[PDB]
Amino acid sequence: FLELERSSGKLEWSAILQKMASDLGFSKILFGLLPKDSQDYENAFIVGNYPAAWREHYDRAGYARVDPTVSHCTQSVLPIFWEPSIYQTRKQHEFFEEASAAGLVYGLTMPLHGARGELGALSLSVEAENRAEANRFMESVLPTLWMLKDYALQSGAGLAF
Amino acid sequence: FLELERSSGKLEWSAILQKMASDLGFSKILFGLLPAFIVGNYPAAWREHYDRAGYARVDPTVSHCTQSVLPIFWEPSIYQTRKQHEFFEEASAAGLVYGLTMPLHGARGELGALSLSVEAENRAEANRFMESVLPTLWMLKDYALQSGAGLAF
Numbered sequence A: 001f002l003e004l005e006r007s008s009g010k011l012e013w014s015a016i017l018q019k020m021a022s023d024l025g026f027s028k029i030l031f032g033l034l035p036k037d038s039q040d041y042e043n044a045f046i047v048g049n050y051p052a053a054w055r056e057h058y059d060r061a062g063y064a065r066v067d068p069t070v071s072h073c074t075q076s077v078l079p080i081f082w083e084p085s086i087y088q089t090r091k092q093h094e095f096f097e098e099a100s101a102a103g104l105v106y107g108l109t110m111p112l113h114g115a116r117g118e119l120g121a122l123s124l125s126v127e128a129e130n131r132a133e134a135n136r137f138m139e140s141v142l143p144t145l146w147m148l149k150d151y152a153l154q155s156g157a158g159l160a161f
Numbered sequence B: 001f002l003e004l005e006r007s008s009g010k011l012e013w014s015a016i017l018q019k020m021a022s023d024l025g026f027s028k029i030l031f032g033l034l035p036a037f038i039v040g041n042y043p044a045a046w047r048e049h050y051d052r053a054g055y056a057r058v059d060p061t062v063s064h065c066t067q068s069v070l071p072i073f074w075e076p077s078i079y080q081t082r083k084q085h086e087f088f089e090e091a092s093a094a095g096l097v098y099g100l101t102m103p104l105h106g107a108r109g110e111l112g113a114l115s116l117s118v119e120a121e122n123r124a125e126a127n128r129f130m131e132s133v134l135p136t137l138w139m140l141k142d143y144a145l146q147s148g149a150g151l152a153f
């Protein structure tokens, strides 16, 4: 975990974080960070291997105002699973439909709240065959993921700022 | 953890947190939150001599909380000035020899700490005690922070 601290740059650090989450069973990973009182999601510090087509479309669609994981991160420190039950509006249902077309079907989102008021997320998708296999998997690794998201926040807030 | 969230009042919430920390091997805990909300069984005299001696600005855990989200294990390694050693010797007198502080930074900007002491006979044994529960502790601190900020403010 503390390799994340050691890393020189965003580049090597980004490569460690992706090895680490891949090692755990995840396929697509997003680390995002904003400084305190900023809603400029379209311009956050972003690391990982999320499909760039999804990220650009998400930007243009204004999906930061729709993504249920985003309003959740601004109010909570606790994980949110990409369960069908977090997609509660016609817009969020449609947001899920497009995220699926990009392979972001099963996963979770750990909110990040740093010591300097930084706000962000560690999102990780898993490539599973049904909600039951996805959820059992994510609960196994949840306690390692719970430590990892804060090491990422601390070393990651360090490189960005 | 879920029962922490099911808690209707601050009193049953602290009872839960105290029992969980106790079941995990800690005997004295402080949960402090600023927007200060204080729960736990810390020696009431210690919280008092703390403020009195203005120890907030010599105690290494406090400076670390303002700057990190990672836990800091209590140790005279950071208590290396002579007052910082009196601070430890005094904390030792109150039973707070071994333990760790989890910093708390909530979604709406709350600032705080979850401190947990362990009774142990040496630093090796103490760190084993805390390392072995660290993943569970890491979840506890965030569950406590979310549910505790929602019931403190």
Ligand SMILES: O=C(COc1cccc(Br)c1)N[C@@H]1CC2CC2[C@@H]1O
Pocket (backbone or CB within 6 Å): B030, B032, B033, B034, B036, B059, B061, B062, B065, B074, B091, B096, B101, B111, B112, B113, B115
């Ligand atoms: O506990 C703490 C940290 O407390 C904080 C920090 C920041 C905001 C608020 Br609110 C509370 N420090 C000492 C470690 C040790 C022997 C003793 C004392 O517990």
Ligand SMILES: O=C(COc1cccc(Br)c1)N[C@@H]1C[C@@H]2CC2[C@@H]1O
Pocket (backbone or CB within 6 Å): A030, A032, A033, A034, A041, A044, A067, A069, A070, A073, A074, A082, A099, A104, A105, A109, A119, A120, A121, A123
């Ligand atoms: O992962 C995320 C974004 O998280 C955040 C939150 C707050 C601040 C910042 Br900066 C980033 N959203 C979706 C999860 C899922 C199926 C899809 C989407 O991509």
